[PDB]
Amino acid sequence: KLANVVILATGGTIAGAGASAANSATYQAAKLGVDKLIAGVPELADIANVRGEQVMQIASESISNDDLLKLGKRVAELAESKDVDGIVITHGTDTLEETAFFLNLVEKTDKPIVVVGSMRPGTAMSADGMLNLYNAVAVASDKQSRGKGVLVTMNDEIQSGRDVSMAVNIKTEAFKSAWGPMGMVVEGKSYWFRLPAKRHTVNSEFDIKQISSLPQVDIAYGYGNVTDTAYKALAQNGAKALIHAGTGNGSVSSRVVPALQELRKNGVQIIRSSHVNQGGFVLRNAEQPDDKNDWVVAHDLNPQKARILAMVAMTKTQDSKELQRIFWEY
Amino acid sequence: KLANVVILATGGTIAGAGASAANSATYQAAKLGVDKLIAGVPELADIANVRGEQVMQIASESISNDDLLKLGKRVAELAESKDVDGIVITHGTDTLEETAFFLNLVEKTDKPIVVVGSMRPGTAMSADGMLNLYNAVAVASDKQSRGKGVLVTMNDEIQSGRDVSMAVNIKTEAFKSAWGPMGMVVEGKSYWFRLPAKRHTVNSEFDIKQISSLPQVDIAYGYGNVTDTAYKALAQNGAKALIHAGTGNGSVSSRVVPALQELRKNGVQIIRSSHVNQGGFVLRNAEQPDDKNDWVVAHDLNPQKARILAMVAMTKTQDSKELQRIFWEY
Amino acid sequence: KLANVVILATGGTIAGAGASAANSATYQAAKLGVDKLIAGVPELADIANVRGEQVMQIASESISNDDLLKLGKRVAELAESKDVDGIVITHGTDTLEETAFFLNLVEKTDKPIVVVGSMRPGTAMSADGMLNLYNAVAVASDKQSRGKGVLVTMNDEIQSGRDVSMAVNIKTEAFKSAWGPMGMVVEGKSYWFRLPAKRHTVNSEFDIKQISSLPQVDIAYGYGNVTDTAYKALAQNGAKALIHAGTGNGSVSSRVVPALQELRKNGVQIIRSSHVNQGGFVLRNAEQPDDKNDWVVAHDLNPQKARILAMVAMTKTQDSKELQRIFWEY
Amino acid sequence: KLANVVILATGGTIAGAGASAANSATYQAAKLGVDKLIAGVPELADIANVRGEQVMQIASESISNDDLLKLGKRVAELAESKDVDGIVITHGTDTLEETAFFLNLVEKTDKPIVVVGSMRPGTAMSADGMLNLYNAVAVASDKQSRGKGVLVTMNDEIQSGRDVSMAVNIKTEAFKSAWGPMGMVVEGKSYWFRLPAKRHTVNSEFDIKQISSLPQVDIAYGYGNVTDTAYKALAQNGAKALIHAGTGNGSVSSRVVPALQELRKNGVQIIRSSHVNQGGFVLRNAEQPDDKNDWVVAHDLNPQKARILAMVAMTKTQDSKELQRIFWEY
C-alpha cells in the first residue's frame, strides 16, 4: 500500500519558467503552482499517494524568518497526522540549505522530511526538477529514511540537510557536503553509505511548536582592510548575535576585535564562522581567545548555517557555554 | 649559474610558533623574521641564491590596503633589478589569495612571483612550511614560471594566484581553484598541465607604478532575512563599491534591491558575487536586471577576490560597463 | 553566417532508450539513429547549420581499434572540407575518454572537435543529452574553440579531451579532470578559464592520414597478491606494450618485476600507470628503476589513456626514450 | 590513566628513507624498525602507553594473502588481551586500503584499529608521518573510536577503512572516500561528523580466527578493444573469482561476455566493479543481465576492495545470491 506523501511548495527554480528551451540559467522563479508540479511527473502515482499544498510562492533569496516559522509549523502539523507518512518541500536553491538545517533542528518527528529544488527551470531542455521531485517523493516514502533527519535529494544523492550547502553555481551538482553524501537514490531505490552523527529531529532539544518568533541574527564578512562598521551597524539595527564570516580559521582582524569585545559586553553573541567552506572547521581558542572574550566558534558550519543554529539556540539560552555546546552537538 | 631569488616576508603561519610539537592548529603567527625562515631551510642554497627582506610581520587577517601598496611597490622595484630573477612572498593563509590576485593585476613583469604560506607552524610535527618554501623558491627559479602570472606553491601544487582560494580549513590542501591546479612541483621540478587564460601581469592594463591609493571597497553578505543595513552602513563609512556576497547566482533579496538601486544612483558601484564558491559563476542579467540597474557581476570571482579586482579597476575607471569588461577579462 | 557543424553518431546512452521515464540508469544504448537524435533538439538551428552521419551504432564498451580508425579517418575527411567549420561526435560514456584523447592526438586540424555523451537516456525524465548536444554544437561553432584541441561538453563544462575521464558513475557530473574544467558553456556562450598545456591536434607529431593500423596494447591491474599471469598471457596473445595499472606511484610487486624485465627484453614496452586517478602523477625512477629496465612512466595519464597514447606513439617509434618524451609532452 | 596502544609495523613509506631532505617522492620503503619509528615521535608518551612489534617489513605493493592473515591473526590476539586498548598498524600506502578493508571485515572486536601511512618518508622536509602516527595513536586511544570499525588517520582525517582509497598520487591528501571523511583529528582530539552504515567488525559474519588460507581472486581491466585473454588466463592459473574492472557502470565488452558466461558455468564467480572510482556505484541488471548470468555487482567498491570482500565472502559461500547480499551489506 503506497505511502502518503504531502508536497509543500514554496517557489524556486523548480517552479520557475524561462523564455526558451535553451534558457537553463536565465528564468523567473516561483511561477508554477504545486498542482502543476505534481501533474508534470505523472510517475509519482507509481511510488506514493501524493497531495500538494502551496505554503508560499517565493524566490528563496527573499525568504524571511516568518516564512521559516510558517513552513516549520505546517510541517509539524502534518507530521502529527496519522494520514501523513512523509513530507517533501519544493524550494529555491539559494536558501534551501538554511531551511533544511532549520527543519532538522526543530521538527520532533522521525517521519521523513525532504527538501528539494532544481538548477534548471522546467521550461529548459534537460531540466533536473522532474527527476529530483520523483526522487524526493521516493526517499520520503522509504522506510530507510525514517529517523535520518532532514534530507536533500538532488543530483541522484541523499544529502544531510544539516551540512549540505549550495556550493557550485549553475550546475545540477550544486549541493555538496564537506562530509559527503550519505546515500544515493536511483530508479526509486535508496542506497545508504553513512549515517548522521549530529543531533537532529526527535533527538533535538528544540521544538518548533514552542517558537513564536525567532531572534534577529545577522552576518558580517571578513576580508583585507575590513573595519568594524558592518558589525556595529547590524547590532545597532537589532542583531542579538553576529555571525562573523572570517577569513581562515574564523580569524578576526585586529581592527575588528575591540568592537566585538564591546558588543559581547553589551549582550550580543559573537559566533566565529568562516568563508573557508569545502572542509575543516573553526577551532575554539585557536585564532582568538574565545574563553576570555566569551565568544563561540561555529565548528564546521558555514555562516548562513551558523545563523540558523544561533537563532534556534537563542530561543533557549543566552549562556555562551551552552551555545558552544549546541554548536558542538548539532 | 643559480637564479637570484628574493624572499619578501610578511608574517603568517609559515613564520609562526606554537607551544609544543603537537600544536599544529593553535599557534601565534608572525613570530620568525625572514632570516630565521631562510636559516630553517638550508637546502635553499642548493636551488637558488636567496636573499630575504622583512616587508611587514603580520597575521594576514589584519592586512591593510597600505600594506598591499607597500608590498606591491617593493615587488615592482625588485622586478626592475637585473640582479633579481624571481620573487617569493611568505604570507599568512587568511588573505594570501587576496594578495596573490592583487599582485597578478598590478605587477607588469614576466619575472616569476610566488606567494606561499603554511597550514602548520614550523614548531609543529610534520610542519608543511619548509617544503612549501623550498618549492616556492624552486618555482621562482624555473624558466617555465616566466610569463605565467602570480603562482601559489602549497601542497606540491602550482596554483594560479588569480583564482586559488583558501577553501579547506586546518588541512595542508587548503588552497584550491575551481579551475584546477595548473601544475605540480616535486623534488625541485615543475610539471605543467594547464596555462592561464585570464589577463595578468605584463598583459594587464593596471600598473602598481601608477597607483598611489586604492578606493575603499567593502563586502556585505546575503542570507535569509537579510536587510539593507550592512550595505548602507558600509557606504556611509566610505565604500566606493560594495561587493554583494549573495546566495546562489548572486541573488539579491527583494528587501535589499531598493537600497542597492539608491546606492548605485548615489554613485556606489554594486558588484554581484556569491558565497557559492566551489564552481560555476554569476551570470549577468540572470538573477537581477544588471543592465537596467547599472550593476556588475563578479563572474567566477569570490567576494574577497572581487573586492581586489574592483579596487584596482577603480584606480582607472568608474564606468560600470568598463568594470564589467574587466570582470570578464581578469 | 552560422557555423556548419557535422554530427557524427556512434551510439551510446545519448542515443539510448529505457522502458519508462523512471529508467535513468537501466536502458539499452545505441537505439536512436542520428536524424531522430538531432530532431530531438530542434533548437540546434538557432546556433549552427547541422547535419548528421551515422558512423557506427555501438555501446562504447564494445568499441574496437577498427572503429577508432574509421571514426578518426572520417573526422579528418570532414576537417579537410571547406563546407565544415566544426565536428561533434555523439558517443557512449564508457570509452568516451579514450576516443576523445585518440582524436586529440591524430587530428591535425584547428577546427573544433567535440565529443559528447549522456548519463541518462533520452527516454528518461530529466535526460541530460539534449542540453549536452546543444552545448557540444555551441562549442563546436564558437571561434573560441579553434585551436584548443578536442573538447568534451557535458555538465555545462568545457573539458579537455586529453585528461577528462569518466570518474563518477550514474550522475551527470561523471566526466572530471584532475586539472579542472577549462571552461563552461551556458545559454550558448563559452566561458574560458584555462588553456591546454600539452601537445594536441595541429601541434601533434601524429597524423591519422598516415596511420592505417594500430599496434595491439593491453592493460593489467596491480593489487595485493597479484601475479605475473595477466601480463604474460596478454603478451602471448599479441600485446606490443603493456600498461601496468599499478597501486600507488605505478608500483610493481616483487612477484611481477622479473616477468616485466623478461617481457621488455622480448620487446614488449612496459608503461607504468596507476589506479590512483584523482590527482598526481607517476614519477620516473621513483618506484622502479625505469632507466635500468628500459621502462616508461605514464605521467598523469590513467591506464586506458596511457593505452591510447602508447598505441598511437608506437605507429611512429618503439624507442623507449622517445616513448617517455611522448608521455611527458602529450 | 593512559590507554595501552600497540603499534604493529609492516613497512611502507612511513618507515622509509630517501637520499636527502628534498627527496619527498624518490625513496626506499621499509627501512626503519618500529622502535625507531616510535622514538621519532616522543610526544606519543603524552597520549598513550605505546609498545611496538615488527610484524613484517615490506613495500606494500608486494603484500601477499599470507601477510594479510599473519597481520589479521596478530591483531585478533592483541584485541583479545586485557592489556590492549587500541591497535595501530603502520603500512605502505599502495595497498593500505586493501588491508584496512580486510581487517574491517574479519576482526570481531569493538577495540579501535587504525591503519596509517605517509606520502613522504621521514627523511624528507615536511614529512607527514610523524603527525599521522601521533593522530593514529590519539584515535586508537579515544573512546569515540570504539565500535566505529577500522579507521585510517592521514591528512588530519578520520576515514573509514571500508571505502577510503588511495586516490591522489604524491600529495599528503592521497586517501579519500566517495562518501567523505567520517571525522577529523586535530591536536589529539577527534571530531565526528558521520557514522558507518555498512557492516563491520563485531557485526560482521566473518572472523579471522576461522580463516586458514584465503581463496585466490584476481582482477582484469576493461578498456577499448579488450579481449577475454586476461580473464581466461587468470582463471586457468587458479582464480576462484574474477573482479571485472569495467568501464562505466561495470560494463562488459561483447567480445568478453561469452568467456565470462563460460567461466561462471565452470564455477568461477564474476564480480562487476569499475574504474570509475570517485563516486556512484555499479547497479545490478543495468549494464548486464546479472540474474540470467548468475553474476554479482560490486556496488560502490573499487576493484581491489571488491577482491578483498570476494575472498572473505568465499570462505563462507559459493552461492552468488549470498555473495550479492554480502556486496550490498559490507
UniProtKB/Swiss-Prot annotation, chains A, B, C, D:
| Active site as annotated | T13
Residues where substrate binds: S60, T93, D94
UniProt keywords (A-Z) are: Hydrolase, Periplasm, Signal
Q: Point out the gene that encodes the protein.
A: ansB
Documented EC number(s): 3.5.1.38
Kindly give the PROSITE patterns that the UniProt entry links to this protein: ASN_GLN_ASE_1 (PS00144), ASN_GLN_ASE_2 (PS00917), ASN_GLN_ASE_3 (PS51732)
Q: What is the lineage of its organism?
A: Bacteria, Pseudomonadati, Pseudomonadota, Gammaproteobacteria, Pseudomonadales
Which Pfam family, any one of them, does this sequence belong to?
Asparaginase_C
Record carries keyword Hydrolase: yes
What this protein is called in its record is: Glutaminase-asparaginase
Q: Which family does it belong to?
A: Belongs to the asparaginase 1 family.
